[PDB]
Design a protein around this ligand. Sequence first.
Ligand SMILES: [Ca+2]
Ligand code: NA
Length: 132
Amino acid sequence: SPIRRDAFSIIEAEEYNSTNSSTLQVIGTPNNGRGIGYIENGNTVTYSNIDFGSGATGFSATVATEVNTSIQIRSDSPTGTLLGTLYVSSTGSWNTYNTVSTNISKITGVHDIVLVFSGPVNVDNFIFSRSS
Ligand SMILES: [Ca+2]
Ligand code: NA
């Protein structure tokens, strides 16, 4: 998977750098894209060297799920700074994707990003939004 990436261009969830998961699979999406699924509570997924430049204050992910769930967004490691939490309610099916966004604390420079899952969700991609 890429060693580094820009925070302000689409990051593919299936191009992760490490995970603790023993269940996670790369899955297909309805329009022949890919994502990650078979995710369980406590799973972490790490994306290396995301460059936030002069600042990001939002996060958007394209997700599908049939359960209410949340995803923590952490910097540097699973126990690094909690930037925010994305709360996702059911999108209607495991193949109905929705773009969902949340606020995060302003982060700058280059950091790894860890997504921490409280339950099953399928994730196609995500992107950050620049600070004002
Ligand atoms: Ca994808
Ligand atoms: Na394992």
